[PDB]
Design a protein around this ligand. Structure first.
Ligand SMILES: Nc1ncnc2c1ncn2[C@@H]1O[C@H](COP(=O)(O)OP(=O)(O)NP(=O)(O)O)[C@@H](O)[C@H]1O
Ligand SMILES: [Mg+2]
Length: 346
């Protein structure tokens, strides 16, 4: 019966007192008072069942978030839906209420070096857990980093997440890609499907640069432009890095470009901590095989105040999908969604 700028937000007697926060991909996000726990929470209404791709996104997200348990990964506290498949039109995901996300925060606020260091550490701590589960997030960016008032950071939005599959990462030059353009590693445009852990480290490097200047570091206007921004700062790849690209069409594209020198990080980020820029460099390395891994990044000097591998937990087991969600109709995905959300029924 409660409505928020229609639409219906029917989250039962448990959640009342709704208030609009923003608009998600397949519905709206509000805060609400949790009459049981006596705190406000966030609730996301998802109406995905009219598009197969929305259903896939939703299923991934629910399955992974229910399995993961980590302080730097948003948890699902509750899921509200109708008692039967027939009656289920919407799903409501309840989470802890966060204050903001890093996208909204960087629109108006300069981060201190201590804030950048702490947020980086938390991103990487959460990512170490994700990667330890053999999962790739594949859409890390500021808006998918939730923040509370005490600067706790939680990674959210696993709708593009997949199990890592390095053996099957190769693709042709200029293969279409769905994840947010600005945070795409250079190999996506050249020879990669984004099925290795290195794709996520590049995104975190883009996020670090964006925390240092309050502006995206590689704001491509279109697919190939993205590559051209990246190369404009990193400069021409070395011969060894080109030789690592066997895809003739991709290698020849890079060979066709005029020589460009590297733009030094200290020029782009004159106010930055030197150790931050050294870690930035290692995350925004062109060759994905040479790019720093999450655990190495945590051990970097920049993060010395926080690094403690005994307090940077891993997952208890790898994550696997029963079935390939890519192949599955609108209707079967609705069925699995119903099953995945069953534990929250009374
Ligand atoms: N758990 C949460 N707490 C507070 N705000 C949230 C939460 N999840 C998402 N949001 C916000 O709601 C809007 C839609 O976000 P998203 O659906 O995740 O894309 C954005 O303003 C997000 O910052
Ligand atoms: Mg999102």
């Amino acid at each position: 019966a409660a409505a928020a700028g229609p639409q219906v937000f029917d989250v039962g007697p448990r959640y009342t007192n709704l208030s609009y926060i923003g608009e998600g991909a397949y519905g709206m996000v509000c805060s609400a008072y949790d009459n049981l726990n006596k705190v406000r929470v966030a609730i996301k209404k998802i109406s995905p069942f009219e598009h197969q791709t929305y259903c896939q996104r939703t299923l991934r997200e629910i399955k992974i978030l229910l399995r993961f348990r980590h302080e730097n990964i948003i948890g699902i506290n509750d899921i509200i839906r109708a008692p039967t498949i027939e009656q289920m039109k919407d799903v409501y995901i309840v989470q802890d209420l966060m204050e903001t996300d890093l996208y909204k925060l960087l629109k108006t606020q300069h981060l201190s070096n201590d804030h950048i260091c702490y947020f980086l550490y938390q991103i990487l701590r959460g990512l170490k857990y994700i990667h330890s589960a053999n999962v790739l997030h594949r859409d890390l960016k500021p808006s998918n980093l939730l923040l509370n008032t005490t600067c706790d950071l939680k990674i959210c939005d696993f709708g593009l997440a997949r199990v890592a599959d390095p053996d099957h990462d190769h693709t042709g030059f200029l293969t279409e890609y769905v994840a947010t353009r600005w945070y795409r590693a250079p190999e996506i445009m050249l020879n990669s499907k984004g099925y290795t852990k290195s794709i996520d480290i590049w995104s975190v490097g883009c996020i670090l640069a964006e925390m240092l200047s309050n502006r995206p570091i590689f704001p491509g206007k279109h697919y190939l432009d993205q590559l051209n921004h990246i190369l404009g700062i990193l400069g021409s790849p070395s011969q060894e890095d080109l030789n690592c690209i066997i895809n003739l069409k991709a290698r020849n594209y890079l060979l066709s470009l005029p020589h460009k020198n590297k733009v030094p990080w200290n020029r782009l980020f004159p106010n930055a901590d030197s150790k931050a820029l050294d870690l930035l460099d290692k995350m925004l390395t062109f060759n994905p095989h040479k790019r720093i891994e999450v655990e190495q990044a945590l051990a970097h000097p920049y993060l010395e105040q926080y690094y403690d591998p005994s307090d940077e937990p891993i997952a208890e087991a790898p994550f696997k999908f029963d079935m390939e969600l890519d192949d599955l109709p609108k209707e079967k995905l609705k069925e699995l969604i119903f099953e995945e959300t069953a534990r929250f029924q009374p």
